[PDB]
From a paper:
The results are summarized as follows.The EROCOC17+4-matrix supports the growth of X-ray diffraction quality A2AR crystals and serves as a crystal delivery medium in LCP-SFX. The structures of the EROCOC17+4-matrix grown A2AR crystals were determined at 2.0 Å resolution by SS-ROX at the cryogenic temperature, and at 1.8 Å by LCP-SFX_4 °C and LCP-SFX_20 °C, respectively.
On the other hand, comparing the LCP-SFX_4 °C and LCP-SFX_20 °C data obtained under exactly the same conditions, except for the sample temperatures, the LCP-SFX_4 °C model seems to be more reliable. The reliability factors, signal-to-noise ratio (SNR) values, and average B values for LCP-SFX_4 °C are slightly better than those for LCP-SFX_20 °C. Since the diffraction data could be improved by lowering the sample temperature the LCP-SFX_4 °C model is used for further structure comparisons and analyses. Therefore, the use of low temperature LCP samples could be a useful option for the LCP-SFX data collection. Although the majority of the extra electron densities are rather obscure, we noted that five extra electron densities on the extracellular half of the A2AR surface can be assigned to two different lipid species, cholesterol and EROCOC17+4.
Author numbering: -1 to 208, 1001 to 1042, 1058 to 1106, 219 to 307
The structure:
Amino acid sequence: GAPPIMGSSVYITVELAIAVLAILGNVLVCWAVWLNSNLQNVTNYFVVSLAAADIAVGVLAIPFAITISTGFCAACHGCLFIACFVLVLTQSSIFSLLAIAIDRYIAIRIPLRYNGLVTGTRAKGIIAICWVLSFAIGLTPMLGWNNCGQPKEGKNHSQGCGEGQVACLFEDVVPMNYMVYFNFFACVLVPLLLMLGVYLRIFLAARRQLADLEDNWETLNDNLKVIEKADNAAQVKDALTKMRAAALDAQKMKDFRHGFDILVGQIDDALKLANEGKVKEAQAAAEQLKTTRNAYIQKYLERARSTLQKEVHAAKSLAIIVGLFALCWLPLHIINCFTFFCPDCSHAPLWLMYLAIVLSHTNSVVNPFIYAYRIREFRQTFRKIIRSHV
Ligand SMILES: CC(C)CCC[C@@H](C)CCC[C@@H](C)CCC[C@@H](C)CCCC(=O)OC[C@@H](O)[C@@H](O)CO
Ligand SMILES: CC(C)CCC[C@@H](C)CCC[C@@H](C)CCC[C@@H](C)CCCC(=O)OC[C@@H](O)[C@@H](O)CO
Ligand SMILES: CC(C)CCC[C@@H](C)[C@H]1CC[C@H]2[C@@H]3CC=C4C[C@@H](O)CC[C@]4(C)[C@H]3CC[C@]12C
Ligand SMILES: CC(C)CCC[C@@H](C)[C@H]1CC[C@H]2[C@@H]3CC=C4C[C@@H](O)CC[C@]4(C)[C@H]3CC[C@]12C
Ligand SMILES: CC(C)CCC[C@@H](C)[C@H]1CC[C@H]2[C@@H]3CC=C4C[C@@H](O)CC[C@]4(C)[C@H]3CC[C@]12C
Ligand SMILES: Nc1nc(NCCc2ccc(O)cc2)nc2nc(-c3ccco3)nn12
Ligand SMILES: CCCCCCCCCCCCCCCCCC
Ligand SMILES: CCCCCCCCCCCCCCCCCC
Ligand SMILES: CCCCCCCCCCCCCCCCCC
Ligand SMILES: CCCCCCCCCCCCCCC
Ligand SMILES: CCCCCCCCCCCCCCC
Ligand SMILES: CCCCCCCCCCCCCCC
Ligand SMILES: CCCCCCCCCCCCCCC
Ligand SMILES: CCCCCCCCCCCCCCC
Ligand SMILES: CCCCCCCCCCCCCCC
Ligand SMILES: CCCCCCCCCCCCC
Ligand SMILES: CCCCCCCCCCCCC
Ligand SMILES: CCCCCCCCCCCCC
Ligand SMILES: CCCCCCCCCCCC
Ligand SMILES: CCCCCCCCCCC
Ligand SMILES: CCCCCCCCCC
Ligand SMILES: CCCCCCCC
Ligand SMILES: CCCCCCCC
Ligand SMILES: CCCCCCCC
Ligand SMILES: CCCCCC
Ligand code: NA
């Protein structure tokens, strides 16, 4: 067989290339949030926590991955730390992505409550807690769910390790039942499915809010035409009562309020006329509503549509991040599933293991590109930093 060092050199070179790009791109994310007060919101606190996890992939996880690829002699608990530390960073990533999804869900479902439910101070506490939980989940093998008690004596003696030491190889020390049931099913797949469910609920909420606006609009316009071609007070009365309901629903910022005050007032004026049986004076009064609609209501309608469209576009941007996370991490998990559940199956070849590892690391490069391409405030701030400071 080809000398192992040849394939190792290609692996190490690619890992270091990923490390540099993971560090530089994610430092730029953090720098941008620092510089630009417009990026300093709770959602971006989770973005920075995720960027920190991706920097730590370049600074620590990749060097650990290079180290463990050599099968060097190590005390089994030191070996476990090096093997498992990336699981902490990946778990931290999952918690940040989950927090972002829920943050955007609260923002679209209860916008008025959002700013007092979701504060900076609560976000900082949630981020600290998520990082502690990530250490506990990812280093669970150090608490005794490990293969340190069943060492590979053949490998130990062939590598010439001293006593207490193992040839530090991931699949020799980390149990595959931990990797498949606990890490993959419980800690990764379940949160990814929850995130899918939350984004689905975001898109369903946006669409139902957009449909309700458009229906309120149409209720207004249709009742305006019912009133015109009407033939008695009871017709005009019914249509006006519908419009009034629709108008109070649409309402649920001074120039905004003035607009709906004019509209509802005009409706109520045309409502009192109708009740007195004055059909033509009611109908005339209702013709006033058209200029109020054109001048105030159509403006609020279009601002509300535009806001919802921006929230959908932002939610799409953030969901793409979750999909690339899944794309980058699932192959390694699926390989572990084959290793674990198919003992009759040939183990995935080494080159495929290392490709899946490298792909998982590439996840720590991509998010800065998604922010630059999809989010104007990031793109513009990256431009300022690159021009001014490079
Ligand atoms: C990647 C680059 C773009 C940026 C990196 C930045 C800097 C700070 C990286 C820091 C790297 C260190 C944290 C790496 C630690 C390396 C350790 C894990 C090596 C362990 C090897 C060891 O213990 O020696 C082997 C023998 O002692 C053993 O066989 C017998 O005990
Ligand atoms: C994020 C996505 C949109 C794009 C990501 C791009 C992905 C596909 C990364 C591209 C890199 C690869 C084309 C090149 C990697 C080749 C590596 C994995 C070869 C490994 C060879 C190998 O087996 O080396 C290790 C062993 O030989 C042994 O020596 C132990 O070190
Ligand atoms: C501030 C940052 C850079 C600190 C980084 C500290 C890291 C590199 C330290 C902390 C714990 C250390 C490990 C502790 C125990 C062992 C077992 C020994 O048999 C081989 C070395 C090994 C595997 C060490 C490698 C280096 C290590 C992982
Ligand atoms: C998430 C997207 C990108 C899909 C990726 C699916 C990947 C992980 C799938 C596609 C085909 C799969 C391989 C098909 C056949 C075998 C041979 C078996 O003896 C070991 C596992 C192995 C080598 C599988 C491992 C996982 C595999 C490489
Ligand atoms: C993508 C997300 C949503 C779903 C994850 C699907 C995973 C868990 C599925 C996809 C393909 C599946 C594998 C397909 C084939 C085999 C070979 C069989 O002898 C043991 C089970 C095993 C190894 C399956 C395990 C579970 C598996 C890896
Ligand atoms: N199975 C596995 N192996 C490794 N590295 C060892 C690759 C290998 C596998 C077998 C072998 O004989 C020599 C090397 N890193 C790994 N990282 C992960 C991982 C992280 C998150 C999910 O899976 N799984 N995983
Ligand atoms: C991109 C900067 C330079 C790239 C590094 C060159 C890679 C050569 C290092 C080889 C060291 C091999 C150590 C033992 C590996 C054997 C694993 C089975
Ligand atoms: C907001 C700042 C980030 C806070 C990070 C602090 C994390 C400290 C380490 C966590 C301790 C948990 C220990 C559980 C694992 C023990 C296994 C030996
Ligand atoms: C298994 C689900 C994975 C699906 C991937 C979703 C991503 C869609 C990509 C379209 C938008 C990408 C924007 C910029 C791409 C830059 C990539 C480096
Ligand atoms: C071997 C290092 C892998 C780095 C791959 C990361 C891909 C990032 C996407 C960049 C696309 C840039 C397109 C510009 C037009
Ligand atoms: C401020 C962080 C600097 C870290 C420098 C440490 C480099 C580690 C090199 C390990 C060499 C191991 C030799 C084994 C015989
Ligand atoms: C920053 C204050 C410390 C956070 C306390 C975390 C609460 C942990 C409760 C249950 C731990 C379950 C860990 C799973 C192994
Ligand atoms: C054989 C070495 C195992 C060392 C474990 C000692 C530390 C206890 C773990 C407490 C974790 C609490 C974190 C909060 C969830
Ligand atoms: C998202 C679906 C998750 C369910 C996957 C469970 C697969 C279990 C495979 C059992 C294989 C047992 C092999 C015995 C011969
Ligand atoms: C990085 C995930 C996609 C990898 C696509 C490669 C598919 C080839 C799999 C064949 C491996 C068969 C070897 C078993 C003997
Ligand atoms: C309000 C913006 C502050 C930016 C926080 C920067 C955190 C960087 C920590 C990275 C840790 C990697 C070793
Ligand atoms: C703007 C407040 C967010 C602070 C997030 C910083 C996270 C740093 C954790 C570093 C742990 C790396 C090992
Ligand atoms: C006594 C030799 C093996 C013990 C492993 C210690 C690993 C955990 C300590 C690292 C500290 C984290 C910063
Ligand atoms: C600058 C970062 C380089 C990565 C550190 C390499 C550590 C390999 C140690 C080999 C174990 C014997
Ligand atoms: C370390 C400061 C940031 C420098 C930015 C240079 C370009 C970053 C490229 C993103 C992969
Ligand atoms: C576990 C991650 C959930 C974080 C939720 C986001 C903010 C909620 C504060 C009330
Ligand atoms: C593999 C399931 C998670 C995918 C989430 C992507 C959201 C569009
Ligand atoms: C339904 C799970 C039982 C199969 C266990 C497979 C472990 C090799
Ligand atoms: C990048 C592809 C890896 C090499 C495939 C076959 C090596 C035996
Ligand atoms: C210059 C870094 C070399 C990688 C370790 C063999
Ligand atoms: Na990450």
